[PDB]
């Protein structure tokens, strides 16, 4: 399989609708209204199969303050594979697709991941941050502590010391 | 289908070849007349850069990236306008339409709002074509936290997309290297 590159924009309203469902059910419940909105914005890679969508992951742009410089970031959205399609490696798939939109248009990629998914990052190049993460909240730099040990970089043109401080931007819901 | 010739194509930046992609630079950075900085170039960079071309030129472009704009406590899914311009031997012809009516569609098929700041010039164009100004002050959350942003003040656009926005209101844009707005 080989994913193909789509824009929220460019998405048909089946299509969208498509997507929401495949993610919510993959994360078995466990994906909000604001999870979705995160989702949105940027570059879906979608993996189908005779008219169904089997996998899908998007990259939405936002800024990491990283050493005083807002770093101009490709975050992942959600990474889902239909549960009867796991163990197939469709998700290096989606991945590839990703990295190719990271390389060409950010300086880094950035995603938050849960214990399990941490050994396929890691496989990829992606490096788990072991700084102090926070947000840059309305009311100021506010400490992440909940997402600590979940964060992965993946540095496209820059070197990384990946023990300082990174701050994403602000927005509803989980920040990471 | 007919030949799509000066309809505005949609292109992400990482799908820009490197010729294109200089061709733009080029050509944007020339339509400003100077005033267009490395730091202005790296926020047309990320997103859906509209394109027309001729003859295998770039002769408009438009980019819309994505960021948020903070409205009453709330960070809205913002489509933002950068290196709106048309080549100056193309000027005159109505193609900037030709990009806007590809720079609203991403918004109405992507984003809670599209926004732009404007030059005095282009302020008509913008709210001809339904864009509100903002008339509530300007600031950006900067990391020691907000701050005004006074200079840009009357100079900000916006276009919600099936959002009510009071567009009295204080309007706080994200932080970045550079104009923030
Ligand atoms: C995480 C996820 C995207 C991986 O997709 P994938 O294409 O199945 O990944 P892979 O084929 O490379 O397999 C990854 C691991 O999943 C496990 N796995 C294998 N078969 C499985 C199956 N039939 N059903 C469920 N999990 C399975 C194994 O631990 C496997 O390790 P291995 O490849 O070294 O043997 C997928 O499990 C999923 O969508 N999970 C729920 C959503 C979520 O957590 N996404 C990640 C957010 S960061
Ligand atoms: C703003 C700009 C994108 C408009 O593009 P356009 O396709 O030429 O727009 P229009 O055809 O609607 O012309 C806009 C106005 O420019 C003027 N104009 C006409 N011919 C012109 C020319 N040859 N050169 C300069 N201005 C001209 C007229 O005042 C016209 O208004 P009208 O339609 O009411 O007569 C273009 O002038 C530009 O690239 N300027 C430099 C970059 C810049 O300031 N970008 C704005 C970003 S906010
Ligand atoms: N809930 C659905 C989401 O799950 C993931 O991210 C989320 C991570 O899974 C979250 O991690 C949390 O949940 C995971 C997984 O259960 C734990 O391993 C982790 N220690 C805990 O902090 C982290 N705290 C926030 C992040 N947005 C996906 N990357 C995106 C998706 O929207
Ligand atoms: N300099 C190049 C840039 O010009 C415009 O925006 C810029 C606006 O033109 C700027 O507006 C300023 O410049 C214009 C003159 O162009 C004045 O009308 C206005 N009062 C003044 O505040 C505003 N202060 C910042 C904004 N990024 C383009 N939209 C984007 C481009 O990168
Ligand atoms: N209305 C326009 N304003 C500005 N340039 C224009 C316009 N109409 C035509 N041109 C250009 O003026 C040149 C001559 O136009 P044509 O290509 O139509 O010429 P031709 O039909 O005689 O072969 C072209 O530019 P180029 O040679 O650098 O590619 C063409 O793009």
């Given at each position: 399989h080989?994913?193909?590159?789509?824009?929220?924009?460019?998405?048909?309203?089946?299509?969208?609708?498509?997507?929401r469902q495949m993610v919510t059910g993959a994360f078995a419940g466990d994906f909000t209204e604001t999870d979705w909105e995160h989702t949105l914005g940027g570059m879906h890679a979608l993996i189908w199969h005779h008219g169904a969508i089997i996998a899908?992951?998007?990259?939405?742009?936002?800024?990491?303050?990283?050493?005083?410089?807002?770093?101009r970031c490709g975050y992942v959205?959600?990474?889902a594979?239909?549960?009867?399609?796991?163990?197939?490696?469709?998700?290096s798939a989606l991945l590839d697709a990703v990295e190719?939109?990271?390389?060409?248009?950010?300086?880094?990629?950035?995603?938050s991941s849960s214990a399990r998914a941490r050994?396929?990052?890691?496989?990829?190049?992606?490096?788990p941050w072991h700084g102090p993460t926070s947000v840059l909240?309305?009311?100021?730099?506010?400490?992440?502590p909940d997402d600590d040990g979940t964060?992965?970089?993946?540095?496209?043109?820059?070197?990384?010391?990946?023990?300082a401080e990174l701050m994403c931007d602000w927005r509803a819901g989980d920040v990471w």
């Open positions: 080989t994913a193909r590159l789509v824009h929220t924009a460019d998405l048909d309203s089946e299509t969208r609708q498509d997507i899908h992951a998007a990259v939405i742009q936002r800024r990491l303050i990283y050493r005083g410089n807002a770093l959205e959600g990474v594979v239909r549960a009867d399609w796991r163990g197939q490696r469709l998700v190719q939109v990271m390389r060409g248009a950010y300086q880094l990629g950035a995603l050994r396929l990052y890691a496989s990829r190049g992606w490096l909240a309305p009311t100021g730099p506010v400490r992440t964060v992965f970089v993946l540095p496209i043109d820059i070197s990384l010391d990946t023990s």
